[PDB]
Design a protein around this nucleic acid. Structure first.
Ligand SMILES: [K+]
Ligand SMILES: [K+]
Ligand SMILES: [K+]
Ligand SMILES: [K+]
Ligand SMILES: [K+]
Ligand SMILES: [Mg+2]
Ligand SMILES: [Mg+2]
Ligand SMILES: [Mg+2]
Ligand SMILES: [Mg+2]
Ligand SMILES: [Mg+2]
Ligand SMILES: [Mg+2]
Ligand SMILES: [Mg+2]
Ligand SMILES: [Mg+2]
Ligand SMILES: [Mg+2]
Ligand SMILES: [Mg+2]
Ligand SMILES: [Mg+2]
Ligand SMILES: [Mg+2]
Lengths: 119, 67, 51, 82
RNA sequence: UUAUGCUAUCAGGUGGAUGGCUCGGCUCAAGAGCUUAUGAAGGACGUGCCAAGCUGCGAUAAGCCCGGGGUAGGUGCAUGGAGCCAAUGAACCCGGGAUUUCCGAAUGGGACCUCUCCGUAGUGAUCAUUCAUGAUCGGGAACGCUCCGAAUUGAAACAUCUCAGUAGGAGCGGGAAAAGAAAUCAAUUGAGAUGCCGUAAGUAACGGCGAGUGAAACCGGCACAGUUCAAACCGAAUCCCUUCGGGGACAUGUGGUGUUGUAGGGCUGUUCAAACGUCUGGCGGUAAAAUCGAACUUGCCUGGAACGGCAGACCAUAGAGUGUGACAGUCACUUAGAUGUACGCCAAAAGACCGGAACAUGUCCCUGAGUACCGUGCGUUGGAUAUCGUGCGUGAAUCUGGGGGGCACCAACCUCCAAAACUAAAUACUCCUUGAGACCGAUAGCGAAAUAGUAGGGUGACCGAACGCUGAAAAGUAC
RNA sequence: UGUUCGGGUCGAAGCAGGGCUGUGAAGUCCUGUGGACCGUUCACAAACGAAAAUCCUGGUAAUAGUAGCAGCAAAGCAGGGUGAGACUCCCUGCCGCCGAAGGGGCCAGGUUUCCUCGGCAAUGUUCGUCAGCCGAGGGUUAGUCGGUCCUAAGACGUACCGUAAUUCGAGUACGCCGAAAGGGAAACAGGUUAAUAUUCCUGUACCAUUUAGCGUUUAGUCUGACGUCUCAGGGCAAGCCG
RNA sequence: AAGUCGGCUUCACCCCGGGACCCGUGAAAAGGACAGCUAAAUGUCCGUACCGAGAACUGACACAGGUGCCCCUAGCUGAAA
């Protein structure tokens, strides 16, 4: 969250850079699929470790996979199949920005998730 | 999970809390003595979690007017 | 064999243990961005302003 | 407030166990009387004497001689040194 | 094959300019504004599994507890290893607690000893009270008040003057402070507390009448607010502490009344009846983190990657902006617009309480003293024989009275009532919060894009740097 | 900056070199490099233009492979090791230095430089395998040694008084500090470690206070407690002789 | 491994006593002694490594200075350090 109090680039970027962890949770938002947006009433939700997303920007557009890991400080997620093979040849995950993906199936093992997504 | 939660400490008795505090102090003594030889701990996070559990026990004792 | 009190020797001990290199793991963690600190010194130079 | 931090386990500190002495790192704010009472309450062995020194790490080391033979070995086994 | 060299270009090295970028700086505006003996700020030392600096914290030591918000990750600057914590709801944020070493107002004593001595375990110093208890002390960016107080400089030298009541000093002190309800300003007859702003005006005034210095009132605004004592008359009719028994103050006067100028009040009589204010009350507003918030992530092309081009589809009380692999209203955070919020703060209806205002009568009573005034010296002032201060000396009056009206005195007229007290708002400032900007853009902008008052320098008072940038992703180069 | 009209990942700014135009300030284009921004109309602003200031900051030459690495203590050689590498590190021998200091002890000061292991980019005026350098780990033990106690010259605190005032000021009173070379309760020899040792260990001692018992004043004196020079006597560490 | 004896001298150290000099007079206080003996317990706190200098201090230095030559020092020659 950064209000229209400050339209200045420096203040916006300072707010994002020094965001608390509970504000960095909201930075993990991603677009919901049409079915999910219809059946939740909201347009977006935070990408969580476990839910299935489709990558829609970058070198891995079209891939569907489960979120392996989320970093709040980096603001990146790791998706099954989105990897960077290194000079060894071992496969390493390539971190993705959550705004570059779309949630197609939510992980709802947490009873608090529904109210977390809306309200 | 942790060694013992706030609910566990408040559930115990005065003697039980003192006994667990003494045992945690003993575990901290043993772990710090192991690191006195320079060698790495067998469980690096164990020392810090023992210290914070000791702090939590002391806080519960101070709330309960035992110390 | 100058004669220090407890506090003077404690301050000398702190000065001594401050005169250590940055740990190698800190250099790895920071990606070679933290490689030194301003409390490095040598005993045979401009002396401590501590004791 | 316990003055005893932990046994000092170095080569020289471990050489004390063969003379029934045991070296501890202690709080530097504490003195020999507090160290003796703390050790006697901590392990329940009578302490014959305390030798203490301050180091250039800012620590205080206490060497404890015990009255009962084998008490240093018993405490070192209880802690886990031996 | 001409070496040593010379000139131009090119390649490379060194170097770190230029460009581009910037979580920093600076300035302005709007807010908000005290804290500490219940031990502050500041400092020392310690505190991390591997931890040296900084930051945080205090032997419960990058932390402990409770409630709320948040929800799936977390483990500071600072993605390294290994672990630990977290759905028993962590991290994080808001509120409230606990712990909180030593020094420090530092306060049991002593400090070239951040420790040490006695331990009778600590109310250090100065004060108020009944002697239960209480106050003061240190800190705070500037602002505020009181007092002390230069010189450079200008005068083209220099002494009065100027610089300047500046610089600097000492004391006090709050969110503001000071001032403040006329012994006023006027002028022929008026106004009606104070502060601040505009103007008067570089005028009056001062001045080697040189250089220069320099008002106020009237008037226009901001904001508005009035009162309390001393005394007369009465005479303990009161106030405070309390273990609720009582105790303390107090006749050298607690309290009631009274509070002022075409005089007022008291005392005696008559009339009208009671306005302001204090307390309760919490309709309702303000109000924590925070919650919700429209509409594309569609085709082809280029590309490592579209937020781009060309087609296509939409939202707009939202086209401020920032992030996202290149230019984004529709991807994310937002925005416009609505919601919610513990403790608090303001707060209207309605109740409880001391009570207010006119007139008549007057050999009646009271109305602030080393004070007002004056002499003399000095400072200060625009204050000139006519500023204010204060050193010495002198020194009144009492309503048939006293002061002022820019030399003194006389008279007339006008005007007020000192020498006791308080008093919101309008004003100032910027540690701090938010916002903004024809500001700077890394030799700039703060000294510091902060492991920066740091490294380093000085015995000390003190002086004081340099250092920003891989990439979309470490894919940080296997063999 | 306002405003008009644009360019850019099919490659912006910048940079090196070049073509063209313009009297010129300059502009534009091309090639390469570069990887994300840049212009333009009409106006408006300014922290707006550098070759100079013994200018400032940074970087970097010539000097120059030059001076120095000599003068006050002219010091090394052989053989054998170690090592990738040896004038320079280790051992043995020979030859030398200081030997009333260059040895021994310790104050102030330093503050880990001490010891062990592992290193050699820098430091070391050469080299280096060495090191007071670099990294890692270890090391300082007290009733008897000092401090601590006492007071000295002399400070500081509180009070009083002064001062416009104070964190300022002399004096007085009461306190308190002020000596690791003054005064002073008491421990020695041996061993032990890699580095501590009157401190740890062995042996043999000693001092102080408190307590308990056994006994008590002589009380006010002495001691602590003292200059310079000179000399006798006695002893003794060291030294020397059979 | 011996480890037993004698002698000489003796500073620059200890004890003791004398003398001379002063227009110079050479600290104080704690503490101690003068009535203590026996037993038991207690003796906390701080320092302690190493250099102490032609390389560990100070002079920007591994500096021919200074701090310190501050206090000590074997044989011969020689009055002698
Ligand atoms: K002049
Ligand atoms: K002159
Ligand atoms: K995106
Ligand atoms: K963008
Ligand atoms: K020594
Ligand atoms: Mg104050
Ligand atoms: Mg002049
Ligand atoms: Mg007033
Ligand atoms: Mg003036
Ligand atoms: Mg928008
Ligand atoms: Mg700068
Ligand atoms: Mg600057
Ligand atoms: Mg130039
Ligand atoms: Mg010689
Ligand atoms: Mg070399
Ligand atoms: Mg000791
Ligand atoms: Mg003393």
């Amino acid at each position: 969250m950064i209000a229209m109090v400050s339209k200045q680039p420096r203040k916006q970027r300072k707010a994002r850079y020094a965001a608390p962890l509970h504000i960095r949770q909201k930075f993990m938002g991603a677009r919901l699929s049409e079915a999910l947006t219809k059946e939740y009433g909201t347009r977006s939700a935070a990408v969580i470790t476990g839910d299935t997303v489709k990558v829609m920007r970058g070198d891995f557009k079209g891939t569907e996979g489960k979120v392996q890991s989320v970093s709040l400080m980096d603001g990146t997620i790791t998706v099954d199949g989105v990897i960077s093979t290194k000079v060894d040849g071992t496969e390493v995950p390539r971190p993705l920005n959550p705004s570059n993906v779309m949630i197609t199936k939510l992980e709802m093992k947490d009873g608090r998730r529904a109210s977390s997504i809306k309200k | 999970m942790a060694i013992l939660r706030t609910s566990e400490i408040r559930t115990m008795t005065i003697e039980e809390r003192a006994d667990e505090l003494e045992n945690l102090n003993n575990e901290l003594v043993r772990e710090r003595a192991l690191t006195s030889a320079g060698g790495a701990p067998e469980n690096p996070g164990r020392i810090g979690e023992i210290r914070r559990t000791i702090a939590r026990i002391k806080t519960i004792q101070h709330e309960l007017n035992e110390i | 064999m100058s004669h220090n009190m407890k506090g003077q020797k404690k301050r000398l001990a702190k000065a001594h243990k401050q005169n250590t290199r940055v740990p190698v793991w800190v250099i790895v963690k920071t990606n070679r961005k933290v490689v030194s600190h301003p409390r490095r010194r040598h005993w045979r130079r401009r002396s401590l302003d501590v004791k | 407030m316990s003055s005893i931090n932990y046994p000092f386990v170095t080569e020289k500190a471990m050489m004390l166990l063969d003379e029934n002495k045991l070296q501890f790192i202690v709080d530097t704010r504490s003195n020999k009387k507090q160290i003796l009472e703390d050790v006697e309450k901590m392990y329940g062995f009578k302490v014959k004497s305390v030798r203490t020194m301050t180091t250039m790490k800012g620590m205080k080391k206490a060497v404890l001689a015990f009255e009962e033979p084998e008490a240093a070995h018993e405490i070192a086994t209880r802690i886990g040194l031996m």
